Amino acid sequence: MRADALKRREHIITTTCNLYRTHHHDSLTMENIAEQAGVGVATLYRNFPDRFTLDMACAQYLFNVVISLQLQAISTFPTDPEGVWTSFNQLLFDRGLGSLVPALAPESLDDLPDEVSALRRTTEKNTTTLINLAKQHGLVHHDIAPGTYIVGLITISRPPITALATISENSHKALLGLYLSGLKHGMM
Template sequence: MRADARAKRDQIITAALVQIGSRPSSEITLEGIAADAGVGIATLYRHFPTRAALYDACAIVFLDRIETLLDATLDGFEEDPVARFESFVWTLVESGVGILAAALAADSSTGGVVERRDAFMDKVQLLIDAAAPHGIIAPGQSPMQLATELIVATRPLAAPLAGILPDVRDRLVRHLMVGWRTTA
């Protein structure tokens, strides 16, 4: 791919990641993503012929980013397990982990996303295995369970509801972390 085409593709993914991480699905349009990326809608479609293709590319980029965070969390985990685990979770929340919603539901026909997701989930299992002896996560929980619960609890809310309950996301995440300790 030419450097200028690659740059436009990256701009589109960056704009989409921002929108997916900060807006409810009903407020996200491909036209809006193209405008935020500074490209025309035809350029967006040239790189991503469908919304699903764009979301898959976003999921792969996001997984690459958070895998670095996961590696850092696992490195030296035993020094302060609770703080490292909670820092990992809160960083996911702040980075808009809801971006992964489509990737969690992807099937084997989705090019590259399933393999990337599964490789990442294998590493999350390492985190679960390290956290369980410290009582941070109850044994028997799966990476997919934790990811799904976190994504559902942190999806951006529509403006009226977000205005009524501005702290709901953080309260739900705190509830999840308590529940993960006790759920088997």
């Protein structure tokens, strides 16, 4: 693939991920995405034959990015547990885990294409490794399951409905600090 075609494809993907964080998910059309990416509809469609394909290419890209954050965190963890644990969660939270998952998840995780499903499995495996490190270093209570942590992180990261949103987002940003505190001290 020509270098410029590959850069253009990557830009369409990045643009789409950003749109999912700033725009109503149901308001976006292929035409809208092409326009925001600064490419023609035909260029968009040659890369991604349909909406599902574009959305799955976005999933694939995001899983690849999450895996690199997990691998950085796993390798760095032993010599800065609290620092790595905190920065890892801050990064997923601030980068929209909570907008991107609902934007891109199909009704069943079984509908993910096989390459994406493989990435999901690696992500779940790395999460267990990370949680086990966190438990080792007293950062996450031992009774908390890895799946509970994941679902919780996705849940607390979902931005509030418009009516409850603030310009600072302080109420929302504070929720991450409280979730990590809860994970550490365990359930009340």
